[PDB]
Design a protein around this ligand. Sequence first.
Ligand SMILES: CC(=O)N[C@@H]1[C@@H](O)[C@H](O)[C@@H](CO)O[C@H]1O
Ligand SMILES: [Cl-]
Ligand SMILES: [Cl-]
Ligand SMILES: [Cl-]
Ligand SMILES: [Cl-]
Ligand SMILES: [Cl-]
Ligand SMILES: [Cl-]
Ligand SMILES: [Cl-]
Ligand SMILES: [Cl-]
Ligand code: NA
Length: 129
Amino acid sequence: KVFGRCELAAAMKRHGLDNYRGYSLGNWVCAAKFESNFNTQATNRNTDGSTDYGILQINSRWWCNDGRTPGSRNLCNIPCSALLSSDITASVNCAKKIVSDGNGMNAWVAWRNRCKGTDVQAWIRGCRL
Ligand SMILES: CC(=O)N[C@@H]1[C@@H](O)[C@H](O)[C@@H](CO)O[C@H]1O
Ligand SMILES: [Cl-]
Ligand SMILES: [Cl-]
Ligand SMILES: [Cl-]
Ligand SMILES: [Cl-]
Ligand SMILES: [Cl-]
Ligand SMILES: [Cl-]
Ligand SMILES: [Cl-]
Ligand SMILES: [Cl-]
Ligand code: NA
């Protein structure tokens, strides 16, 4: 499912994302945009063997199990295919444990590099929220 901007915002806000750990909704929506393009089915292989999954490109190294990332963890307690689902709940619930990890949303490369310190509200401008 290729989410629409304001659609995704509504759905993150509902899953308790807006202002989670101090990160207003425009953050997460930006992150999504850049990590994944609002596509729930997006993957990328990392050079080390890991694969990033879904709307926020959560990574198999630490966070989920795809059973081809040797030496990796599965700290969210899910298979990685649950992150490609058109429902985003797993994705969101995982984000909560990652964002809470002490690097904040620096955990998301795209975010730190492309959203951090910009006007993130622009991404929620025009939204029935
Ligand atoms: C939380 C998470 O998985 N963050 C990943 C990061 O590990 C990786 O450097 C980058 C490219 O794969 O994409 C981010 O989404
Ligand atoms: Cl957009
Ligand atoms: Cl915002
Ligand atoms: Cl594995
Ligand atoms: Cl494989
Ligand atoms: Cl475990
Ligand atoms: Cl599994
Ligand atoms: Cl949903
Ligand atoms: Cl923080
Ligand atoms: Na894993």
